Amino acid sequence: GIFTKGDLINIKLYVKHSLELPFTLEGVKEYIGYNDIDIDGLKPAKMATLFKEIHDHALSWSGVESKVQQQSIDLENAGKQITLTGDEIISVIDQMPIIERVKNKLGDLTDKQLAEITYTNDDKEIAVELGNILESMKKDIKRQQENTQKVKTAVSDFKLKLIGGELSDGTIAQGLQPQISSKKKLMDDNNLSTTIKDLQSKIDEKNKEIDQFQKDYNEKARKQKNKLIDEVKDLQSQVKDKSALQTSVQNLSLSFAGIHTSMVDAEEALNHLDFMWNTMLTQITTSRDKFDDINDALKLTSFVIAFKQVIEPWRDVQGSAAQLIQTFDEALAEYKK
């Protein structure tokens, strides 16, 4: 399928790296490297809120993955059931002569079993009569459409919380990735280095004055020399503080670049997985809508044509479900290795 093992690997790597991040105020303050900053966007409270949101998203991924795997198994089983039963029914109806195929209608077969053909629904209930089989299959297809829709909603909500958009409940959610980008831009466009350079230039001029005074005198100049010494001491303490803060901000920018890279890699994978589940949901909806065209008054030839149209998408559905199962097994084994 279009969703590869590398895609799931990228998603799981993003989840792991996001779980390695701290989510408490003290842990956030230790990670960012400061307890306070003059920049309101980089305040520790906002950073802690963003980290906590990322942490909750990473926690939600496990439930999303489980839902995807469980519904893929269910779709493979339901597709095998529907395909095999429908093929048996179609072959049995095709074996009878053309004259009965044209004169008889579907209703002439609904009240009796079609040559020991049986169908078991999602509630483990068995149906033997053809009409009961068709109604049970219709209900199963509707329920599988609902379940596939729920899984697609889960995957879409995960991806939208990552990149941004309107969630399933109508809530407008700003993506965690653009928020990471905004914070990184705040880290990269500030005047910390400017203040550092200005203070350092003042200190260098005063140090040149101190050097010249020391070289030249050894009374009024002595007091000026000591005044310059005290001024240099104060400005140097300020420079040390601001230099530590600026180094922390620069390193945090690097860390946020890494977070952004991981989020970007996960985004493509989520796009692929969402597309695959949407394709399967569309095929199931096509099957349900075609089943809506079945009635007892139809001739056996028309019924065979319509029922072929009904059960055709389930072949692709079960193929895609088996592909998802295989890719998940391979990717999880490779991640455990």
Author numbering: 41 to 258, 287 to 405
From the article:
XaxA crystallized in orthorhombic space group P212121 with a unit cell dimension of 67 × 90 × 153 Å and two molecules per asymmetric unit (AU). Phases were determined using the anomalous sulfur signal of the merged datasets and HKL2MAP, the graphical interface for SHELX C/D/E. The obtained phases combined with the given sequence and a few placed α-helices in the density with COOT were sufficient enough for phenix autobuild to almost completely build the structure of XaxA. Interestingly, XaxA contains two large loops connecting the helices, a big hook-shaped loop (lp1, aa 136–169) between helices αB and αC at the top of the tail domain and an additional loop (lp2, aa 202–215) dividing helix αC. In XaxA, the tip of the coiled-coil, predicted as hydrophobic transmembrane region is not resolved in our crystal structure, however, secondary structure predictions for this region suggest a continuation of the coiled-coil. Interestingly, in the case of XaxB the tongue is formed by an amphipathic helix, while XaxA does not contain such motif. Comparing the structure of XaxA with that of its pore conformation (see below) suggests that XaxA is already in its extended conformation as soluble monomer. Since the short hydrophobic region of the head domain resides inside the membrane in the pore complex, we believe that the clustering of XaxA monomers is caused by mild hydrophobic interactions of these regions. Interestingly, the protein was not incorporated into the liposomes and no larger structures could be observed on the vesicles. This indicates that albeit the hydrophobic tip of the head domain, XaxA cannot spontaneously insert blank membranes in vitro. Importantly, YaxA does not contain the hook-shaped loop (lp1), which is a prominent feature of XaxA.
Xenorhabdolysins are also found in other entomopathogenic bacteria, such as Photorhabdus luminescens, and human pathogenic bacteria, such as Yersinia enterocolitica and Proteus mirabilis. They are composed of two subunits, namely XaxA (45 kDa) and XaxB (40 kDa) and are only active when the two components act together. Xenorhabdolysins, which were suggested to be binary toxins, perforate the membranes of erythrocytes, insect granulocytes and phagocytes and induce apoptosis.
